[PDB]
Design a protein around this ligand. Structure first.
Ligand code: NAP
Ligand code: NAP
Ligand code: CA
Ligand code: CA
Lengths: 410, 411
């Protein structure tokens, strides 16, 4: 019972509403008792984001680049109703957006799985981790209606005074609609770097979906760039790891995902990752059972968080004194994942040990049958759920806490 | 009570490989012995499309437009390999894309369910019917890699002689990639008309996914057009059946599809409908249990078929001379679906009842354990099925024929 320490620092980003109440508890019960982390702490509450005029958000991001690891609690992103609620003198940009620009990199969503908790998709046994390429295809396109008959044309004008090449796209007769989109080789090459680095670190294979049958050039450039890089830099390493990479056609990927056991990383384009991430996440079940995690292209800088929001509907009931059974595992797993990275970077196996315990002690505690209300509802259905079927949030943490001590051997 | 018939006509398209052999028995066994509806027959064997330069294809399209109701056996879509196998001439176009263009409107995939055959998604208790647009967008789009540094711009050049309209799209420094797509107001309008008609006729409610969050002008146009057309011609008729039209984003809709019981028509754009139809394909179980049906904008003209292809691999065992358990139920349902549409235009409640019992009989056939391999692998899983769990194709069709004549008697 020597409490574990570290050698580098861990950047903590505190947040809002219900997840903050949960954050605080976790640190008191599942982290600070068992381990001493140096923590550079930025408070990203809405209150304190407003007070520093967002400066702490940016400060937090740069710290993550200096130090190399960050955990983030759910933070409210301000909108119109929020500016009236919290009296903000500015509608500040979503802190994730701010953070993500500065760090750069790609977001991987990895769900936590338990035996007894069933999935919507019977086949699924292991994580399917979708990486999403955020730099714009349709998200930075330029769209327009066509009210007159006429002709939609595309010019590529070379900057070295060279001859423009132009493209007949369509001659409309009645009305219509037109669009143009783009992407960079550098944005793609960074998307690729992230993916290869994540899947390698995780010791999973990597898939890539495109529709390159139809868009032989546009979607072709993705397939190629991944290929260029793979057999250059990654193929030997993956092959030592017992993993691989293949490009699949998007039509096969959805079918493969449907039919498959799982246990792989799925890298897909901006639009595809956006559409798929929601069905996929639904299918695995509770949003408390999944974590986000941005990974820069080098693979040394990581920001990690639960893939749910500040779960406000519950933060009301907590204010009103009512019992609440918000699921804390995604939050808890943000800590363990993030601390793991820290350990893997500093080559620190007492800390890397701890993270393995907690991760699996959580799965044990639910696998045995102690679970928050949402998981009960997967097993037992939404009618049928009685109070003895779920622990509330606080008594679940106290339940993983004892079970952790049990497995503090070594 | 002997054999019955109807005054309107079916339009039979003969197809090729395994599905052509199943086709031959389906008729002789399950439908012709109990139903004698007139048939303007058109053979569409890959054989014959070489022998008439893809021109029986087009003839058949216009045959259906003229007559109102087609049924189609699967056909080969010429690969570069199929050229060497059959004959040179031209590496032809797809007879599906050929007949679909000629007739206009939209294709709706509808799965068939059996209580004892599980889905991969533990909530799908009712069918989910994707209608894919199948025109424009990324499927007729121009694309280019960008090797130099330069500007990508878009010009709209009016036909009348007016001012071009230019759009600065991007300025490349390194290398990049570019693209442009169109869709037309009259393709979305006919996409819309068909869906509203189809959702109505089948008494299911109608969703439409877009991305008008992102693509305000482009996707909005779709949103606005269904909104226009719903109010002005369908919103009344929908409420007089107890159904609704709603738009959702594509994110909610795929979250919906996954968590929802089913029993709706989901109009998808050309790219969403290609992708999503494949997730639904696998999720329901077997392509043996799904029919593609093509409805024109007016909704008075249909060409129905099976969602699967010719089942080449099975046909290869048929040539070795070996046993095969190819699932005919989609092909049979393709008949009972056309004939049903033939009946509701003749007001023929006799033929309408035959189609419903035949379908009821194939369902209870499978619910009492009599089934083909694919459905055996759907229950027991790929590597745990043995010969004693499934019937071959002949045994199966014969098993339902026996079951059919008893249900004809007891009434
Ligand atoms: N990481 C981030 O920064 C991030 C991301 C997204 C949203 N948000 C913020 O969160 C706020 C609320 O957004 P929201 O309520 O739409 O999204 P949400 O927090 O994901 O809540 C949606 C609903 O999902 C259920 N849920 C989510 N997490 C859960 C958990 N851990 N345990 C049990 N149930 C859970 C709850 O349903 P019931 O009502 O049935 O209990 C909840 O009301 C917003 O102000 C937004 O800015 C932050
Ligand atoms: N006109 C059309 O309706 C249409 C549509 C799509 C494709 N096609 C054409 O069909 C040809 C063959 O393509 P394909 O083999 O990839 O697709 P397919 O004919 O749909 O067969 C795909 C595979 O899925 C399984 N399967 C499909 N239908 C089945 C059934 N009724 N019963 C049992 N198993 C079934 C079989 O796998 P196992 O052998 O593993 O059991 C089969 O080999 C191509 O030339 C293609 O162009 C035609
Ligand atoms: Ca999304
Ligand atoms: Ca497809």
């Amino acid at each position: 019972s020597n409490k574990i320490s570290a050698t580098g620092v861990l950047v903590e980003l505190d947040g809002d509403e219900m997840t903050r109440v949960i954050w605080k508890k976790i640190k008191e019960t599942l982290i600070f008792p068992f381990v001493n982390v140096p923590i550079e702490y930025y408070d990203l509450s809405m209150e304190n984001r407003d007070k520093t005029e967002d400066r702490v958000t940016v400060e937090a991001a740069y710290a993550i680049k200096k130090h190399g690891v960050g955990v983030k609690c759910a933070t409210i992103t301000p909108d119109e109703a929020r500016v009236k609620e919290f009296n903000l003198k500015k509608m500040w940009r979503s802190p994730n957006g701010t953070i993500r620009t500065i760090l750069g990199g790609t977001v991987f969503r990895e769900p936590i799985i338990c035996s007894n908790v069933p999935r919507l998709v019977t086949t699924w046994k292991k994580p399917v981790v979708i990486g999403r390429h955020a730099f714009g295809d349709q998200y930075s396109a330029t769209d327009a209606v066509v009210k007159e008959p006429g002709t939609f044309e595309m010019r590529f004008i070379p900057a070295n005074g060279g001859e423009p090449k132009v493209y007949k796209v369509f001659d409309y007769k009645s009305g219509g609609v037109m669009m143009g989109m783009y992407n960079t080789d550098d944005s793609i090459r960074d998307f690729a770097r992230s993916c290869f680095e994540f899947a390698l670190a995780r010791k999973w294979p990597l898939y890539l979906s495109t529709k390159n049958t139809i868009l032989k050039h546009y979607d072709g450039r993705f397939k190629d760039i991944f290929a260029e890089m793979y057999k250059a830099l990654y193929e030997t390493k993956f092959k030592t790891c017992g993993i691989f990479y293949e490009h699949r056609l998007i039509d096969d990927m959805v079918a493969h995902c449907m039919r498959s056991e799982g246990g792989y990383v799925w890298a897909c384009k901006n639009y595809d990752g956006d559409v798929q991430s929601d069905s996929l996440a639904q299918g695995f079940g509770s949003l408390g059972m999944m974590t986000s995690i941005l990974m820069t292209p080098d693979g040394k800088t990581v920001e990690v968080e639960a893939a749910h929001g500040t779960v406000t509907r519950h933060y009301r009931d907590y204010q009103k004194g009512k019992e609440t059974s918000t699921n804390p595992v995604a939050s808890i797993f943000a800590w363990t994942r993030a601390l793991a990275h820290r350990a893997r970077v500093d080559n620190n196996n007492t800390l890397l040990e701890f993270t393995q315990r907690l991760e699996d002690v959580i799965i044990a505690t639910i696998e045995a049958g102690a679970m928050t209300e949402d998981l009960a509802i997967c097993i037992k259905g939404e009618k049928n759920v009685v109070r003895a079927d779920y622990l509330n949030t606080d008594e679940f943490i106290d339940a993983v806490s004892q079970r952790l001590k049990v497995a503090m051997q070594k």
